[PDB]
Automatic annotation (TrEMBL), chains A, C:
Keywords: Magnesium, Metal-binding, Nucleotide-binding, Nucleotidyltransferase, Transferase
Domain of life: Bacteria
UniProt protein name: Glucose-1-phosphate thymidylyltransferase
Enzyme class at the top of the EC tree: transferase
Gene: rmlA
Residues noted as binding dTMP 3 in the record, renumbered to the chain: G115, H116, D117, G220, A251, E255
Binding site for dTTP 2: G115, H116, D117, F118, H119, G220, A251
Coiled-coil blocks: none
Annotated organism of origin: Pseudomonas aeruginosa (strain ATCC 15692 / DSM 22644 / CIP 104116 / JCM 14847 / LMG 12228 / 1C / PRS 101 / PAO1)
Lineage of the species this protein comes from: Bacteria, Pseudomonadati, Pseudomonadota, Gammaproteobacteria, Pseudomonadales
Length: 293, 298, 293, 298
């Protein structure tokens, strides 16, 4: 079966104002590229080419202007709007017609991942034709997230959204893989006490039926925090340190399309031309003649 | 016949950065990118406010003017009056005086680059000296590692500025001209007579050289105890953010908070500052504005 | 066969003076722990418990004072001196009696690694009873390192030390696994034109006999640069960002010993006592009651 | 009978940090850790040199005194005279005056913490005012986020300092006393009469309060345009390193280069500075010392 992707790049309220007064958090850069390149690249690494970008009404033209229809990168991009930030599970209602009868994956527009064999980690989750897959990651501050509790055998037995007394330090990350049941589960959700349609309620519905795979994303992966001005700075410095050490980019969509064979050398060469005078286009030109393992 | 019985107006040039920082700047102008906790343009705006300037023209691209207007409005909230103009093509810094000719009128002026960040002690007093000069031009020179990127000032043995060179391959000194410029009423006429350089730009260094040739350029040293932060590259932008974060988290005080500067200048009163804090009350920025109302800061 | 480890933590000349005037680079911290904890942890992750620490004559008492005989961490540590910085291959002459008839691994005392399944990456190299194994890593500045050239099939065909015209961007990292032949190869080395016994000559001797395994260390791993004041800062910020995000430490030797079962819960509890009032001892105490996957 | 016909001596307290930063500090004292490109102790040493102080006592643990001596020697290379003393047990900051009693003799003094870093414009002049006071004590107050970690100064409505509290749970202000202290000849006698606090330390705040009670404490504000960098935690040490790196790489000038300060004070001449550059000539620090010989820096 085909798997379609959704990037939810909705409003971060007023929490980062005045920095985000003028423009959505996900159109701002982490080091050298727009924040949205990172979760987009995550979906591309999972082999997903048909992708819905959900943003605020005000910033959808900007996401559209930035990414186009995706055909330059061998993708098929569509756009939709989330009028009010009334919960992550709204993605599946907004995206119901887009998803149709296919499998799906949701990624949050402000989620950054780095590490070895992430392609294989996503490949495994994407291969499951039934059930849902999520990733749990050990964090200092689990109370900010959906929290997973495990029994002594290591089986996931409960999920709580932003608990006052977290049962573990394992947070659910902002990457979710779903089968054909998710739209119908989302359509039956009721708003929580904080007035949102909760993705954790979606995940708990799968858990109750024994159909939730909780994979550990180990400590050798970085799931970088973009929630505060402080953590934003850290993410930028993290990406800068890797890129300047390696001479290789993290989450370059043009590169990922080229390595997936979704575009050819001639198309990559055309994409390198507009930015030929700066580091990004120079990088793209170098991809045409260097073997990188 | 004219009658006498002067005001200084400000201009912020915030016209993006072409393709130099793409793809980071594909969706939005460089000068709306945050430096740590606030939009880049807050920093040079705060610099003009610290110079006592209340009437300011923001020059930006046609595409992003509405975003600057959304952010800053007409300035009345901060005791300012802000006007807006567009720069359809990036034809050089000195074009600010042609675009802003009607805005300037017969007044003195100051131009600041929308990506210039300054920090340090007695900066208010450093600006005061330049602002109080009613004739000629005033610029600031700062020692940098890479003067070849800038307008460079050469000094004689007595410390007098004797030449200015734009991006010399072999700089005569390490003293770069910073992106803050004070001018008298001669500047619009000087700017009108400029020809484009080989790189296709109306050059601010040519304006400054015109004042130098008339013996009316003051070059003040901005000493090494001030920070003039680099926003030219993705690397330097990260450094700028880290620098501001380090200071603010150490001190519990903000750098370039326009609400604060307006309040300290008595351009807005306590009642007004309280109203500005209300929308941001659930975040650290609003809580800071609230703390300002009761705390004495020296 | 048993595999023994060597950490070469010798002099970095005058290149980082005056910062390193008073004390060796490898006794200074990267964020929250002495630099030497990082390569030590790397050897421990490879399952190596018997380890020789080689330092300058002046700083050996300090390494000795810091780490002891290793019995507190379930290790067997020994110490030796490198009087002059006359090449990395001197490790095998200095360490000849220590190595005896066993397999060996050498790590540089200023080499920091991070990433997922690094234990498995080292396990594979450590399992080889014959030949040598090294890791190649794509870098911006290969001219600083031993550089590997590959043919079109991806086979390593040459190695050059600090070439003026590097044949690729793949640098050999500072972790080397050797069979029982390395001492004898090292004993036959002649000094290079720069007056050093070159580890690259050791590696080329294995390459010539078709006995060098060059594994790619992929871009999902971080091999952090400690060669300059600038890169030192970056390494610290990199480790800080991971540790403060996760609430888990990178290269905590006490933790690695505890997870290898080289020390028990009662021994870890004793190790947590001296530093109980600071973050490091608090971390160690938390390890006794938390399951980390 | 004594005869009259004053000199100020300096003390740097560099006695480690107990176990607080272990295991990072197991092998070496905190004050020998680099901040970016130079040992931590260069920063407060440079601060005393900027105050015009040439005769300085370094107090350290018995274990690390040889390392400080290896680094700094007798000071003659930099136009200083350095002496050394040991602090066998960490019994409080004010113990510096008992350990250093013979060193101080009948002179004025200044005490700086070996982990205190300062940066900013006219810092030389800020120190000058304090140094020139021949009687009483002078300290500096700085606005911080976390005054509960420090000696805290309370001010009346006229801006006069009226109380000092060590680590108050409910601070009266956000003004912390920095780790730089200027004293007259009364300090050794004040220090001799101190009793240990509940935490088992001879407290500098008690010394300062004694001067306050005699009406002889000057509290000068170190304004928000100066950086007083935090070295208390692993996090803050990284921030300090990043802050210095950002300034030095922007300016092509160093912060707290003792060779430079000695040269600018005319305590060493060009010939001597050339000799100091020779050992470090293949690295950036030696190349910097060389550049100093030909370049005019304002
Ligand atoms: C660093 N990573 C990475 C690669 N590894 N590869 C190589 C690569 C490997 C496998 C398949 C493809 Br297509 C491409 C790449 O071309 N671009 C990459 O950015 S990643 O898998 O950790 C990742 C990327 C984006 C967002 C989150 C994680
Ligand atoms: C840190 N500085 C500063 C202050 N010093 N004051 C206090 C202050 C002092 C004097 C006059 C006024 Br109004 C307000 C303040 O309210 N806000 C400030 O940000 S500054 O002079 O380095 C500066 C600010 C913006 C851009 C460039 C430099
Ligand atoms: C982050 N890493 C790591 C772990 N992964 N584990 C868990 C762990 C996994 C497998 C075996 C053991 Br023992 C312990 C751990 O206990 N401590 C660790 O630091 S690492 O493998 O990338 C690494 C450590 C030191 C130096 C270089 C790399
Ligand atoms: C950056 N500063 C500085 C200088 N300003 N000068 C120039 C200079 C100016 C005035 C007198 C002398 Br001597 C030397 C210098 O040669 N070295 C300097 O580091 S400082 O005043 O913020 C300072 C230094 C060390 C520790 C704390 C603060
Ligand atoms: Cl892992
Ligand atoms: Cl200065
Ligand atoms: Cl990889
Ligand atoms: Cl100030």
């Amino acid at each position: 079966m085909k798997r379609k992707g959704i990037i939810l790049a909705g409003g971060s309220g007023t929490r980062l104002h005045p920095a985000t007064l003028a423009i959505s958090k996900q159109l701002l850069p982490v080091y050298d590229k727009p924040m949205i390149y990172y979760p987009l690249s995550t979906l591309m690494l999972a082999g997903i080419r048909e992708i819905l970008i959900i943003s605020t009404p005000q910033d959808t033209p900007r996401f559209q202007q930035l990414l186009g229809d995706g055909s330059n990168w061998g993708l098929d991009l569509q756009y939709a709007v989330q009028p009010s930030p009334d919960g992550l599970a709204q993605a599946f209602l907004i995206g119901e017609s887009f998803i149709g009868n296919d499998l799906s994956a949701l990624v949050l527009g402000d989620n950054l991942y780095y590490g070895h064999d992430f392609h294989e980690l996503l490949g495994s989750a994407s291969q499951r034709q039934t059930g849902a897959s999520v990733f749990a990651y050990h964090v200092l501050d689990p109370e900010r997230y959906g929290v997973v509790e495990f029994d002594q055998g290591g089986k996931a037995i409960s999920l709580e959204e932003k608990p006052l007394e977290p049962k573990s330090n394992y947070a659910v990350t902002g990457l979710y893989f779903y089968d054909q049941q998710v739209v119908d589960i989302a359509r039956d959700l009721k708003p929580s006490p904080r007035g949102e349609l909760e993705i954790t309620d979606v995940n708990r519905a799968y858990l109750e039926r024994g159909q939730l795979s909780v994979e550990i994303m180990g400590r050798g992966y970085a799931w970088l925090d973009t929630g505060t001005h402080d953590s934003l700075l850290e993410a930028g410095q993290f990406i800068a340190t890797l890129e300047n050490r390696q001479g290789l980019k993290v989450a370059c969509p043009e590169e990922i399309a080229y390595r997936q064979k979704w575009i050819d050398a001639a198309q990559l060469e055309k994409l390198a031309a507009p930015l030929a005078k700066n580091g990004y286009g120079q990088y793209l030109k170098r991809l045409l003649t260097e073997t990188v393992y």
